[PDB]
Structure formats: C-alpha cells, structure tokens
C-alpha cells in the first residue's frame, strides 16, 4: 500500500532517534554515511548506525557540560566535540576513548569546524570573542584571533587558509590565518547584510559559497570567491524562525549543493531548493526548536536534531 518510491535502505522513510536525555544541539553524519554523531545537552555523544538497526552502539562521555557542536574528522574514525564546559575534545570513534582534550578557551566553546583538506586542524570560536585555530599534533593552539564580541559560528574554508566567524556583532568576518601570525590581526572580509546575530555557518561543497543562518530569521548566501562583486551577498531565504531560545541554529548544504536545510525554532525542519530560493520541504514532527539538520553524504536523506531530545532520520520524496 501507498508504495511511494523508497529512496534509501532505511527500514522506514521517517526514523526518530531517541535515547538522549537532553537537548540535542548538533549532529553529524560520518563521511562514509553509516554513522551518526549526536551531541546532546546532557554532555554526551551518541553514536548511531544509519542502517539496519539504528543502534546507538556507543555513548561517549567526558564533557562536563552540553556538547554544543560535533563534526567528524575527514576519515570518520576521529571525532571533534565542542562544548559549554570550555573544552573541545578529540575522540576515537570505534574505541570509546578520548584522544586529545584542549581547553584553552575561557568561556563556552560554541562553534567548531574541522578542516576537510590538509592536516588534522579545526577552528573553534567561543564566547571570549576569540576564534582559535587548533592543529592536532601540537598541544598548544596554533592560532588565536580576537574579535570583540562572543563568537557564535565558525567554519574552515574548503581550501584551508581562511576562517569564517560570525556572531552577535551584526557582521560575519573572514580572516586569513597565514596573513596573521600576530595576536591582533584585523579582519579581511566583512560580509554585512544580516540584521542581527549569526548562528550557523556551512561551507559549500565547491567552497565558493558560505551559508549563514541568522536570528535575523534569514538565511543568507554569500560568495567567498576572492573576485566577487562589491556585495558578496547572493541569496536570501525566508521561512524559518528564531525565538527567545537563541539556540545554536545551524546551516547545511545537501551533499550536492541542490538543497539547503536549516534548523528553526518553530520546530520545523526547513529544506529550500537553493536555485529558486524557495521551500521544498517543511517537515513537522519535532517538539523542540530544531538545532541542526544534516544531509546524508550519499543519499538525499535528511536527519534533524531538536531541543526535544530526539533526532528524526528520514528520506525526501518528490
């Protein structure tokens, strides 16, 4: 009955992931697309399989406060967790052991992004208005830039030399780390056009486009190509929501650059078609503000995480 074109191998087209005991603040799909890293407010990371049971086969603990942001490392076996307990942590996924815990920040480490081409290096931007760059094998932080306003969202560019940081200061900045080996570098690019804070930053699958979610209830698409018009602003999306919760609401690109998914505070999973700049999917089902949405590496699968201690995991039909 109803036989509507099963896309994925998942048992069902809509799967809810439960087992957390707090808000789920950020999630991430394995590069090989058969793992889930879910970081909750309960300062814990659930590791789920994407197929055949959706088994949370490991719960990694070790943060003393909410694990606000999780990415995987480029090979998928090491995990980068960032928290409110001022401590970013590198873990081994298969094992259940923590590898390297760096806690150099003074306040909540809101945002992080690990570099996708090059060395094992990740940026982390926290409440101290400082965006710091962290190389894996040294135990000191390799870079430290100081804005004046608490850093909400940070990303490392496709190519690996600049860092994007956006926060409460109404303008997102692009900085050059090789241009800066000093302790008070000044910003390279000032993307303006959001009318208040930025909450989430995603680097496009080609690297020319940066996605910014703003509590300006606006998704904005900028181009980072060093040869741009005077206004790097390309696209605007309307539809999602930000409320008094001021949660860390993020961005994502479909693995093809064809869709863009935002987490919203109206409990809705929003998925726009980037081209027509209009709303493809408006999926309900979450009882709390939708914190981050992640598109599965291979298939059109979208998985969302909410402040309702669950994660919906399903495929898109049209």
């Amino acid at each position: 009955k109803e036989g509507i074109t099963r896309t994925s191998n998942l048992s069902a087209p809509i799967i809810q992931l439960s087992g957390h005991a707090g808000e789920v603040f950020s999630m991430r799909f394995s590069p090989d697309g058969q793992c889930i890293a879910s970081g909750s407010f309960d300062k814990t990371i659930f590791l789920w399989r994407t197929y055949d049971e959706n088994e949370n086969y490991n719960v990694i603990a070790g943060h003393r406060n909410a694990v606000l942001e999780v990415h995987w490392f480029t090979d998928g076996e090491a995990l980068l967790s960032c928290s409110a307990d001022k401590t970013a942590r590198c873990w081994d996924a298969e094992t259940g052991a923590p590898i390297k815990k760096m806690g150099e920040h003074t306040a909540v480490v809101n945002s992080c992004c690990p570099l996708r081409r090059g060395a094992k290096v990740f940026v982390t931007g926290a409440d101290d208005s400082t965006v710091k760059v962290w190389d894996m094998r040294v135990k000191k932080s390799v870079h430290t830039l100081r804005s004046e306003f608490p850093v909400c969202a940070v990303a490392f560019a496709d190519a690996g030399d600049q860092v994007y940081s956006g926060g409460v200061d109404n303008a997102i900045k692009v900085w050059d780390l090789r241009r800066g080996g000093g302790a008070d570098v000044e910003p390279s690019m000032l993307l303006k056009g959001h009318s208040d804070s930025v909450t989430g930053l995603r680097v496009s699958p080609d690297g020319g486009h940066l996605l910014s979610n703003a509590m300006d209830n606006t998704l904005r698409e900028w181009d980072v190509r060093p040869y741009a018009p005077p206004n790097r602003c390309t696209k605007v999306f309307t539809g999602h929501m930000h409320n008094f919760e001021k949660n860390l609401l993020r961005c994502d690109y479909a693995a093809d650059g064809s869709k863009v998914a935002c987490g919203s505070a109206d409990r809705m999973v929003y998925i726009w078609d980037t081209s027509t700049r209009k709303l493809l999917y408006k999926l309900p089902g979450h009882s709390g503000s939708v914190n981050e949405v992640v598109f599965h590496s291979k298939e059109p699968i979208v998985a969302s995480a909410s402040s309702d201690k669950t994660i919906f995991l399903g495929e898109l039909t049209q």
Binding site: I15, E53, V59, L283, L313
Partner: protein, 99 residues
C-alpha cells in the same frame, strides 16, 4: 635497557671470530647473554674470486641458542618481528502534524 625495545625483534650477531648468528630475540641478561629463537650460523668463507660475497656464506641451522656476552661484540637489527551498546533506540514513527 633499550634492548627491551628489542625482544621479539629479529637480530644479527657478530662473534669475535667473526662468525654470524641470525635469530629472533627472547630474553637478555645483564652479562649480555641473549636468547636467540630460530638461530642460524652464517660463517664467512674466504671470497674465491669470480663469485659474489653474498651468495656462498656457509649457513648452518643452530635452532634455539643462547649467547654469552664475553664473545658478543656487535648486534644489529635484521628485520621486523616475524608474524558497548548505549541507551539508544530507533523506532519508526510518523511525523505529527498541527492543523
């Protein structure tokens, strides 16, 4: 000692009479005694012109041997050593709708 880094690692030995012993490392004594597993004696015969130095060094197979340091002069490496489910569930559920 750092030759604790070297137990199970295959090694070659020189004697004072310049006879060669190749085996794998088992246990070592303070007196530079050694325990060689799978040991064989390579004794250098004089090089008779027209043949490679590498192709006719007399190999005898000694088996398991133990080495007294007094005539132990030099040791080198020969080769390598020879050869939580968590409280999560996933269940299928439709997404609820407000109307």
């Amino acid at each position: 000692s750092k030759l604790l880094q070297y137990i199970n690692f295959r090694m070659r030995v020189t004697l004072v009479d310049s006879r060669q012993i190749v085996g794998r490392f088992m246990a070592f004594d303070r007196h530079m005694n050694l325990v060689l597993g799978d040991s064989e004696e390579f004794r250098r015969l004089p090089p008779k012109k027209g043949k490679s130095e590498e192709e006719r060094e007399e190999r005898r197979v000694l088996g398991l041997v133990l080495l007294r340091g007094e005539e132990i002069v030099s040791l080198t490496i020969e080769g390598p050593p020879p050869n939580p489910g968590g409280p999560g569930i996933g269940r299928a559920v439709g997404r609820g709708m407000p109307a």
